[PDB]
Design a protein around this nucleic acid. Sequence first.
RNA 1: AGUAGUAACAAGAG
RNA 2: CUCUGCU
RNA 3: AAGCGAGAAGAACCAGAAGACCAGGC
Lengths: 736, 17
Amino acid sequence: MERIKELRDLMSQSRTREILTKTTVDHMAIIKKYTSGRQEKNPALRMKWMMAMKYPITADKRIMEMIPERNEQGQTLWSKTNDAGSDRVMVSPLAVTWWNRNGPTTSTVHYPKVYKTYFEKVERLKHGTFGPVHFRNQVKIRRRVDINPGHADLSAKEAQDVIMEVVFPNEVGARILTSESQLTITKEKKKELQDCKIAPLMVAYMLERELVRKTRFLPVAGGTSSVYIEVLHLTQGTCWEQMYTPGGEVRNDDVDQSLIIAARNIVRRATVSADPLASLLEMCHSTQIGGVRMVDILRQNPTEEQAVDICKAAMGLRISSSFSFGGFTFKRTSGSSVKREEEVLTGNLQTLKIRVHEGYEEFTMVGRRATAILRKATRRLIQLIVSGKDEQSIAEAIIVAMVFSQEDCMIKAVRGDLNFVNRANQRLNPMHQLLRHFQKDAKVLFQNWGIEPIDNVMGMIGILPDMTPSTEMSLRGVRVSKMGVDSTERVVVSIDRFLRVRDQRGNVLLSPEEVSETQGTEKLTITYSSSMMWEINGPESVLVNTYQWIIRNWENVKIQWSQDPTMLYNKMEFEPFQSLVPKAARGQYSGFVRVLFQQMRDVLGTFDTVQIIKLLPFAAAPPEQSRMQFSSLTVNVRGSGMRIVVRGNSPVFNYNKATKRLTVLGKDAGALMEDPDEGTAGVESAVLRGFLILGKENKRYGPALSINELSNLAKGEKANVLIGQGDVVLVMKRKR
Amino acid sequence: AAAAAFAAAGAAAAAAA
RNA sequence: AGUAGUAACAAGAG
RNA sequence: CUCUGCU
RNA sequence: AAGCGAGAAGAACCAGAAGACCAGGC
Ligand SMILES: *O[C@H]1[C@@H](OC)[C@H](n2cnc3c(=O)[nH]c(N)nc32)O[C@@H]1COP(=O)(O)OP(=O)(O)OP(=O)(O)OC[C@H]1O[C@@H]([n+]2cn(C)c3c(=O)[nH]c(N)nc32)[C@H](O)[C@@H]1O
């Protein structure tokens, strides 16, 4: 046998014998990388230099017997010299071309199977569909996406075990495949890889690529699924979007997530409409997910989601009135709740702002290996009855119910290193973070939750923190039922004008209020096909496109604002912006801005095009009279309140006077043509409700005053007010 | 029968010992 | 000579 | 006379 | 929703008094 003969020869040589005998297998990892050569600091230069010499390539010694030393032209394909630091010999590129020309051919039917990922890229690009290219003010946000979806059912370790089985069955070790998915994929791969001469290392690397999920932080603007990320360069550009639909099958999870995102955006946008039901219907009939119409995916996609359910109700489809959480499908059998954000301090001394649900409510929990009935109040688990098949399932159900309760002891039970912001400092979902932390370890949570006296409740034995069943004592409000209690029914519902879903009896099942406020990213690119293409985009895109639309239509917007501002405010183009405006402050902001616009109209001159551009979107909502003074207007953006400053320049809304160009969130929105009627002349008169800005202060009418308390002035008097970025200015209460 | 539509988080629990 | 610039090349080692 | 052109 | 290096188990592991007498509670 060749290899044993080589081993005998190596043992024959004294120095190689000493190396082989002395060095251990552990020490091999160190001496394997033993190299005198150093990494080339500028490989491009070295490569350019070495392509001029005769023999820059190195090949295995066997080349000398399987390639002639020279071709018919006499050019030496290879030489006798031995490559430095190895037994390989020197070779010219001519040798490689000769091998590709008249070399020994073999079978390559296996290559597509082992390089499955690359040929899948080829195939799904072949069957992709190209739509029109649309030139739009693209706003790409940097976020983690997946480049290699991997085999989701199999974690990285399972993928490694399968790779060892398939490629190196003898070197597996003690590992045994348990997950059925492992067995099936190992089987198919072994059958496919039969008599594969390709190097086992390459097969292992390709299998690692195919199976192990890999993610990457990339600036994206469409779907974040792999089928869309790999073609990201082709699809999304700086100023254009290429409507592309990759061919082949699409993971059901990605379509479900994208449908949820689209439904959330549509309902959130449709709430601020004058006819929310009709608007929602129009965005449903005009939206497409992954190249598929959104109208016909709801009737075939049972994904449970209050937004998806509202959309289904709008089309007459029976809803479930359920929602996923922690892997369990929750159906609210009875009770009602209202969302409200509230700040909590965790057990690890970290401060969180979690969305608490005020109100008593009762849920039915359905899981893959568990089922429970829960009743909770505001941050209080009134009762929980679990019916898990095994202790692990019971523990999972109990932990999920515990976290879902949002109880203070739950929050205070956090211990160790738990971070609620990723490495990009993006705010994570606190509920998901708590679920992950407690599923990793729940000893502290059960210890700090409490124990309740339990009587001999028939078929409802209590459970203790150590997971052993008990009769007299149990976790507070937690019981375990052995009746295997085990909802899916789709009840037909009627949805009113304002998207309030009521069953036959008339109780409000779903309302837009309980729709999640998070602004997630779709897995599959979502395309909207109305006149204003940006209705269902993220916050930044909506802001930029709203201001860009105002700029473009500025010629008509000016005249409409001067002679008929009520219709300008009605303009639907501002509704998505209002969707970003917080619901509580919408009316007050609209009233304040409308009053400022009216005073600007009344006062001769003092016209400010940039100010109108800045404040016009906020005027869409119905006015709400108030005396409060606004230093900035707030808009929701990915859970952050962006403050648009009424007076001055702020990063959210910028007007570069040198270029006369307006940039929103760092994205250019266009330039404002010079308006001879502007005539700012220092005085603005469109900053404070009922006040006129004289200009720089003069330290005779008063030292300084604050914006809010400035309302003390009665009429006519002049005073200095601290408004803006530390720029005290003189003001006066308008005559009327 | 009983099935989970979408299960986030790592799952399991170290309390069981 | 010249390249080049705070120190080198304008061949080096047997 | 041989070796080297990032050592 | 999150997502930035690896694991698994050689060998084998309890004791009797009984009898008499005295004191004592009930
Ligand atoms: O990726 C998102 C979401 O899709 C965008 C995705 N997802 C949801 N549903 C599915 C699904 O069926 N299949 C797949 N593949 N993916 C799905 O998971 C993520 C969802 O989380 P996120 O959007 O970041 O926030 P949110 O939707 O709020 O999730 P979470 O905060 O965990 O809450 C989920 C539901 O719980 C409701 N809820 C929580 N509590 C405490 C209560 C409560 O006390 N009472 C009531 N009535 N409801 C409660 C939340 O409102 C939300 O509905």
